[PDB]
PDB file of C-alpha atoms and ligand atoms in Angstrom:
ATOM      1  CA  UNK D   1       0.000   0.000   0.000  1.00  0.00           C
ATOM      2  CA  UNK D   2       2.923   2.469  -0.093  1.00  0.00           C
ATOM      3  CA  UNK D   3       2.542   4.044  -3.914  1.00  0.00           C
ATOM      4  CA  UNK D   4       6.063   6.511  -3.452  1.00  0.00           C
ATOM      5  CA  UNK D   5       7.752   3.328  -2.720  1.00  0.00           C
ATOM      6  CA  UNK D   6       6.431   1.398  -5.599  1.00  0.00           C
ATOM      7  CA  UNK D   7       7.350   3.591  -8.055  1.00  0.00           C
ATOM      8  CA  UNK D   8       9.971   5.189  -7.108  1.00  0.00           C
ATOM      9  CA  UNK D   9      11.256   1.403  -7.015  1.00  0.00           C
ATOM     10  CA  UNK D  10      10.029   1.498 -10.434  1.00  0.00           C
ATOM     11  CA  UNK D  11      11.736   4.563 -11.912  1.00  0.00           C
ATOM     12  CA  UNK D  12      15.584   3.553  -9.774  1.00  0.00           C
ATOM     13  CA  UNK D  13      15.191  -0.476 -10.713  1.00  0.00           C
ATOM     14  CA  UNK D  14      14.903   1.186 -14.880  1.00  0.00           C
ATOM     15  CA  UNK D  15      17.481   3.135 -14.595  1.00  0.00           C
ATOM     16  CA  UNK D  16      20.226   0.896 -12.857  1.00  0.00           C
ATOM     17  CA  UNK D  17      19.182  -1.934 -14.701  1.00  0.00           C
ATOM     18  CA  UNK D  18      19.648  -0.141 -17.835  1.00  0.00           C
ATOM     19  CA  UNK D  19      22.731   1.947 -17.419  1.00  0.00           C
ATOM     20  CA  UNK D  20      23.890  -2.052 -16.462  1.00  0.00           C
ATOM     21  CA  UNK D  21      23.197  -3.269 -19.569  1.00  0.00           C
ATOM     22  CA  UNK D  22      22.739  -1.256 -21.428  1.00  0.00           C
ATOM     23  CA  UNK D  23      19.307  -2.581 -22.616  1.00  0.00           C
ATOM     24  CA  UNK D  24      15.907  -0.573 -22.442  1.00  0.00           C
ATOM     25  CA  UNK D  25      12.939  -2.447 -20.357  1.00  0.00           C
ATOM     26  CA  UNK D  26       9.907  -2.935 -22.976  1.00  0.00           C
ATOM     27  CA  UNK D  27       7.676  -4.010 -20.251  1.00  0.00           C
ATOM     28  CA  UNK D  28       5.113  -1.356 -19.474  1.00  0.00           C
ATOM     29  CA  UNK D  29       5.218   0.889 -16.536  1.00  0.00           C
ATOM     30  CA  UNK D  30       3.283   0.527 -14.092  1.00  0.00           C
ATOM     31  CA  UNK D  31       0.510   3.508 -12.396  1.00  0.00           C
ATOM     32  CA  UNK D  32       1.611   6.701 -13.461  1.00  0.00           C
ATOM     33  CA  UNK D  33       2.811   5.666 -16.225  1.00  0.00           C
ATOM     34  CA  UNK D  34       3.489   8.842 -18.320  1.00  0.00           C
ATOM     35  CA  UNK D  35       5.281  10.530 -14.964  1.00  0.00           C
ATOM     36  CA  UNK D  36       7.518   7.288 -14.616  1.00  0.00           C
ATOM     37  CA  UNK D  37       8.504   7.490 -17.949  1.00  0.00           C
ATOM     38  CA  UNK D  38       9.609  11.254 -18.099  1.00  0.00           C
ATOM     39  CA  UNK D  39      11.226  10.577 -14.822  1.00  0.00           C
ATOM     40  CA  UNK D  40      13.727   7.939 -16.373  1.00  0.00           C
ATOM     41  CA  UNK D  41      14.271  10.487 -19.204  1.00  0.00           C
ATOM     42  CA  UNK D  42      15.033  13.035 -16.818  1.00  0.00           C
ATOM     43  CA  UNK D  43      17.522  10.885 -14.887  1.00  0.00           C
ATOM     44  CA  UNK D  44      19.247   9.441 -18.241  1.00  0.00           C
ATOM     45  CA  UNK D  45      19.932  13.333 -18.958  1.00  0.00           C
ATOM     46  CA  UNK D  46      21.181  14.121 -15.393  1.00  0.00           C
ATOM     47  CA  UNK D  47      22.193  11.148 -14.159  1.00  0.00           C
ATOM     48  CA  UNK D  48      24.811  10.434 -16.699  1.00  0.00           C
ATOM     49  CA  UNK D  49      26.136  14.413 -16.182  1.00  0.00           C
ATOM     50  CA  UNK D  50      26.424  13.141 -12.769  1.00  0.00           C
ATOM     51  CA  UNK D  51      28.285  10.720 -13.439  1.00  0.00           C
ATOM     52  CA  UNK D  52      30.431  12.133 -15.921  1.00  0.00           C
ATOM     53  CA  UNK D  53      31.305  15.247 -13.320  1.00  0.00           C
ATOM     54  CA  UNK D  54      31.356  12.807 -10.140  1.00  0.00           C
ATOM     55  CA  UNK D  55      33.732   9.937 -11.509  1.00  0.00           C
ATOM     56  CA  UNK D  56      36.324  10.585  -9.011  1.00  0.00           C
ATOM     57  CA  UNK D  57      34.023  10.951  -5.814  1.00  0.00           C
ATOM     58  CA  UNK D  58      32.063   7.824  -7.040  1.00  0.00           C
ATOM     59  CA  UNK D  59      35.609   5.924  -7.410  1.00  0.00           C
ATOM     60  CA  UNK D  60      36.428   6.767  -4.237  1.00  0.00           C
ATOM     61  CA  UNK D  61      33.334   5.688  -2.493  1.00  0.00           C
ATOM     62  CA  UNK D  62      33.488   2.483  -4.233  1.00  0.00           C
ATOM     63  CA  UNK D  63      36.788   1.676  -3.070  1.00  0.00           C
ATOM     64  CA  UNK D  64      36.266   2.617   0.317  1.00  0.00           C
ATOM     65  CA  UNK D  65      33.021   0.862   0.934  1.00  0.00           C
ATOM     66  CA  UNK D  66      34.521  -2.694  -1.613  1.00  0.00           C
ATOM     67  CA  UNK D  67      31.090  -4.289  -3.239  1.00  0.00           C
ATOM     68  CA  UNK D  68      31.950  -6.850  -4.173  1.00  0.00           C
ATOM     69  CA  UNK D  69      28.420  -9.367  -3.691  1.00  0.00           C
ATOM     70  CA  UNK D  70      25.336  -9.558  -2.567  1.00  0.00           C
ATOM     71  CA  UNK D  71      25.991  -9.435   1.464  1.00  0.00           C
ATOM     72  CA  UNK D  72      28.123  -6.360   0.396  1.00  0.00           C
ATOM     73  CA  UNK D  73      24.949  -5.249  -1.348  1.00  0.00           C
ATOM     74  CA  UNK D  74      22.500  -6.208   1.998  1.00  0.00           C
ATOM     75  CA  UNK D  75      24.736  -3.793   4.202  1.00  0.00           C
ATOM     76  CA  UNK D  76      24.962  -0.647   1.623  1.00  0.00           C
ATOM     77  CA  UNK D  77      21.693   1.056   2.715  1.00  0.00           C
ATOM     78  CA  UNK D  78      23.064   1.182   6.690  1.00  0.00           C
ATOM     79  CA  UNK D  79      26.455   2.845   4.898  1.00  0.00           C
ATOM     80  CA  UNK D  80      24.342   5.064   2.355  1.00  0.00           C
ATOM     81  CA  UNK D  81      21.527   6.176   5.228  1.00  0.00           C
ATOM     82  CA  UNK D  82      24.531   7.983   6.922  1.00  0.00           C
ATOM     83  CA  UNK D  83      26.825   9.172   3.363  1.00  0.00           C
ATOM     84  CA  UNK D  84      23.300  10.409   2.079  1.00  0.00           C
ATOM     85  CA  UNK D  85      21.215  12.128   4.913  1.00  0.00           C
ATOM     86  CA  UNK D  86      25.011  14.021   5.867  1.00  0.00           C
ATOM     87  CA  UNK D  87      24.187  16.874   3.523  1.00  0.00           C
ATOM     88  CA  UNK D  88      21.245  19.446   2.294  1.00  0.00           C
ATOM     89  CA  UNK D  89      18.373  17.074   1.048  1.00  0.00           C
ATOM     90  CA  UNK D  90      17.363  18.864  -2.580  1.00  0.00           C
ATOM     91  CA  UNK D  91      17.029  17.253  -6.117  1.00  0.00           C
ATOM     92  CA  UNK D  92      20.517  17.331  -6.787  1.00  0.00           C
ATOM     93  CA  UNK D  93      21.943  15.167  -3.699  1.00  0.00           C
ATOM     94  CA  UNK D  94      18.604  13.003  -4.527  1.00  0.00           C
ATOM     95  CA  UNK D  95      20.149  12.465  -8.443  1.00  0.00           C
ATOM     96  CA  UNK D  96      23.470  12.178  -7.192  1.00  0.00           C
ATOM     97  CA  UNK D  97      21.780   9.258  -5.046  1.00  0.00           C
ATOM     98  CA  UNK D  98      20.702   6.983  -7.983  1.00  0.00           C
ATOM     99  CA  UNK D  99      23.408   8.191  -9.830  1.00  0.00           C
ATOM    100  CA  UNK D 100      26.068   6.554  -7.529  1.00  0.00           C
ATOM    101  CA  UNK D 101      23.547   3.588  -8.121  1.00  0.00           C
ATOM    102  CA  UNK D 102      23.544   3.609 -11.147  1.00  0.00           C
ATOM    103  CA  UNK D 103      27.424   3.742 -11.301  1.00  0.00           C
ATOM    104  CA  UNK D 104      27.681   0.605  -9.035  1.00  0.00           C
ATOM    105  CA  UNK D 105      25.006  -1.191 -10.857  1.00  0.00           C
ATOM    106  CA  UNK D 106      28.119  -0.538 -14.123  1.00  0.00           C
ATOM    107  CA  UNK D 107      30.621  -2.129 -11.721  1.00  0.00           C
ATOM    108  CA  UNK D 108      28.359  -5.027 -10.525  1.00  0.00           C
ATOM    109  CA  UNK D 109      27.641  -5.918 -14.419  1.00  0.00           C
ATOM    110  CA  UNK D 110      31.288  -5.653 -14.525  1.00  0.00           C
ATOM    111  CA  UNK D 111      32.231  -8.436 -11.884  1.00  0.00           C
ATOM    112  CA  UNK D 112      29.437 -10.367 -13.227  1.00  0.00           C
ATOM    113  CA  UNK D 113      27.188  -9.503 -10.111  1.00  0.00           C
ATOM    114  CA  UNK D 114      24.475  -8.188 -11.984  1.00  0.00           C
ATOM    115  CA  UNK D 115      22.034 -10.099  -9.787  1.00  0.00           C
ATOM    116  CA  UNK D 116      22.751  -7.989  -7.392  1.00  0.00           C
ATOM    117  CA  UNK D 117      20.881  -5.345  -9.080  1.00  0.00           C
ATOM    118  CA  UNK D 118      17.652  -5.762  -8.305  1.00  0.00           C
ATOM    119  CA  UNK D 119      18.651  -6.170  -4.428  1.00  0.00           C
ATOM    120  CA  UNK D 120      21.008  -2.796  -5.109  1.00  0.00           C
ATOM    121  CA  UNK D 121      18.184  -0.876  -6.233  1.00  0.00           C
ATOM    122  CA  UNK D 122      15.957  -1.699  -3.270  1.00  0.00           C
ATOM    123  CA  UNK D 123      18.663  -0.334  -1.575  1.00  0.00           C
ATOM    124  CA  UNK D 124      19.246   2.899  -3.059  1.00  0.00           C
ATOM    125  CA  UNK D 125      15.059   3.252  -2.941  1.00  0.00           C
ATOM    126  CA  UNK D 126      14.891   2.216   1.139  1.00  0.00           C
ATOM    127  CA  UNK D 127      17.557   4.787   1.661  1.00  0.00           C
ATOM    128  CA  UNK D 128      15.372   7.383  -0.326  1.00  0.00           C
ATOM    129  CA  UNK D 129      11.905   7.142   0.591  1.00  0.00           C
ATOM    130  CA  UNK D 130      12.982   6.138   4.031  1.00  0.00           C
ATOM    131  CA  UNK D 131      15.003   9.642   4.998  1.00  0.00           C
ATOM    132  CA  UNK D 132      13.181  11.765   2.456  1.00  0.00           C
ATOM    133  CA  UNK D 133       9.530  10.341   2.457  1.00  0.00           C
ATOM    134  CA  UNK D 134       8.190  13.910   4.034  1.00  0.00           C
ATOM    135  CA  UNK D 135       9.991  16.002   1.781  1.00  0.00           C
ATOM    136  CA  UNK D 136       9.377  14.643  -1.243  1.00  0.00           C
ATOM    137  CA  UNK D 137       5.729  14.387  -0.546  1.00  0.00           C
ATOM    138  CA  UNK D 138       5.960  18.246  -0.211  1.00  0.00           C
ATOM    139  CA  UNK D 139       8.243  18.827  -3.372  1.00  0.00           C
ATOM    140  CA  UNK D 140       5.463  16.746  -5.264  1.00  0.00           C
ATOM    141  CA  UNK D 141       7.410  13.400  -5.776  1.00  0.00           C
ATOM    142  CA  UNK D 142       8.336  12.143  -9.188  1.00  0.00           C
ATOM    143  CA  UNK D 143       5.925  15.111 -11.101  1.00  0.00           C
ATOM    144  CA  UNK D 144       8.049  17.199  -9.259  1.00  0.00           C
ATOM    145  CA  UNK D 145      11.265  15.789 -10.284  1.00  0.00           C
ATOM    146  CA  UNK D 146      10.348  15.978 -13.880  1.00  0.00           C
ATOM    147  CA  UNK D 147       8.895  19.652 -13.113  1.00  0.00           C
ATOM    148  CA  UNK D 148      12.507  20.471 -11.544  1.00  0.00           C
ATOM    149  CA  UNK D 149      14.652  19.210 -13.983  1.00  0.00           C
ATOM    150  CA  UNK D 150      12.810  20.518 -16.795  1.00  0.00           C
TER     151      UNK D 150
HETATM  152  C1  NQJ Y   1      22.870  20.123  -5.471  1.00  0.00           C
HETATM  153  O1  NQJ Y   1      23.285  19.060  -6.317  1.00  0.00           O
HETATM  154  C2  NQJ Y   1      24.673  18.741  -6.492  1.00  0.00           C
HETATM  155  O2  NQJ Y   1      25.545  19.535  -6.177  1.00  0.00           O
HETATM  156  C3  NQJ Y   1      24.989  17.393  -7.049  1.00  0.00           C
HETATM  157  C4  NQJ Y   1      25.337  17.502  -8.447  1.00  0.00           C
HETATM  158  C5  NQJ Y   1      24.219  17.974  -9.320  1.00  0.00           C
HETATM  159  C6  NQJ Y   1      24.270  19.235  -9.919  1.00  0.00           C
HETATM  160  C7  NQJ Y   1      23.241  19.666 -10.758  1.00  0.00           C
HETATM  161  C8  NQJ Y   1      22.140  18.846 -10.987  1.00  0.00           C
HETATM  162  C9  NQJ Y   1      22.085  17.589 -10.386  1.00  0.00           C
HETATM  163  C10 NQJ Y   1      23.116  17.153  -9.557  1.00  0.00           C
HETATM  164  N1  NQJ Y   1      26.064  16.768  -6.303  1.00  0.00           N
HETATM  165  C11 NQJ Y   1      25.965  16.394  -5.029  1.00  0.00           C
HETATM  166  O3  NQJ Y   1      24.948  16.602  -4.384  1.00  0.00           O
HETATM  167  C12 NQJ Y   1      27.126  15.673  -4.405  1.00  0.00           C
HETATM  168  C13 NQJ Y   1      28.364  15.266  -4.903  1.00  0.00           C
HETATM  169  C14 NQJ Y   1      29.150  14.601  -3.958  1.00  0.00           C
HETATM  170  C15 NQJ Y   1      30.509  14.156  -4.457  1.00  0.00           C
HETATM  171  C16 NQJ Y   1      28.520  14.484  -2.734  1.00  0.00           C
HETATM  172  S1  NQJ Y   1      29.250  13.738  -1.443  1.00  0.00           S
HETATM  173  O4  NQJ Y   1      30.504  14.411  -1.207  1.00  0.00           O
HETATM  174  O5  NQJ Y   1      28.361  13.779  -0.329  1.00  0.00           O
HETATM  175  N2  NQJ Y   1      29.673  12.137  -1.949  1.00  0.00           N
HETATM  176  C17 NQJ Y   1      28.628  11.172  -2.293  1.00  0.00           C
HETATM  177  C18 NQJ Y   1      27.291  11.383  -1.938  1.00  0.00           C
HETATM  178  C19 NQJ Y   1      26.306  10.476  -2.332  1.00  0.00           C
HETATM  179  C20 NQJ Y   1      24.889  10.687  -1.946  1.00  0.00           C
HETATM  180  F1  NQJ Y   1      24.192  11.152  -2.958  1.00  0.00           F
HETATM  181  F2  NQJ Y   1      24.364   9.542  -1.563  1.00  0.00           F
HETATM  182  F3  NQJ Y   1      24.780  11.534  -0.944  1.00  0.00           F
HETATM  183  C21 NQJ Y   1      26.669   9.357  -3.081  1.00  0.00           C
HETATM  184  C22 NQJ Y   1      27.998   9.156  -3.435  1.00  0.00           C
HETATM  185  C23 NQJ Y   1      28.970  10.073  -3.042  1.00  0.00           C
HETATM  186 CL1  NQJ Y   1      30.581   9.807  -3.489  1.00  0.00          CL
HETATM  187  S2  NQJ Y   1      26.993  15.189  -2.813  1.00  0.00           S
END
């Protein structure tokens, strides 16, 4: 019964799966549809600026934290709680968020962990809609994403 979760689940799984492998979901979205889908537009446009600009931060995290499986993946949310909620909560932390996803999700593929995700973006999506439930209720969730970053 918990609709931010679901597709905010939605939107993160997309994009990590597919900056992964590089392979577009054909499956339908789910409710919402139409907001879901410019969401993942907007984060393909962002997120990989992100990523290009945040390389050596992201590098550095990765070392430092060493995911390397899926009990590595189990404990990242308890480690990303405290990296993410140390900092002003606004769009651009939230990107940088699935971003740093979306950059693991790359180096899982790469170790041929990419079962790990699905669990991973769980992860990233607990840590979000966990700390930030209130605020992105108020900022209009994902319509206001897509509003933002327009
Ligand atoms: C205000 O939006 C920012 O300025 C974004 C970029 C941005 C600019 C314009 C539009 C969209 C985004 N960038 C940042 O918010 C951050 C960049 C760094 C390097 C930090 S950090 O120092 O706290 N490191 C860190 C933090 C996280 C997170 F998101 F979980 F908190 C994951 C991984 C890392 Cl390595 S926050």
């Amino acid at each position: 019964s918990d609709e931010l979760y679901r597709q905010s689940l939605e939107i993160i799984s997309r994009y990590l799966r597919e900056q992964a492998t590089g392979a577009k979901d054909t499956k339908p979205m789910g409710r919402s549809g139409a907001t879901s889908r410019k969401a993942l537009e907007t984060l393909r446009r962002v997120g990989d600026g992100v990523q290009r600009n945040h390389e050596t931060a992201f590098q550095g995290m990765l070392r430092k934290l060493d995911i390397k499986n899926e009990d590595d993946v189990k404990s990242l949310s308890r480690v990303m709680i405290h990296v993410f909620s140390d900092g002003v909560t606004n769009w651009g932390r939230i990107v940088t968020l699935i971003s740093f996803g979306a950059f693991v999700a790359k180096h899982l593929k790469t170790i041929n962990q990419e079962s790990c995700i699905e669990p991973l973006a769980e992860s990233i999506t607990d840590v979000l809609v966990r700390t930030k439930r209130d605020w992105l209720v108020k900022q209009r969730g994902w319509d206001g994403f897509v509003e933002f970053f327009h």
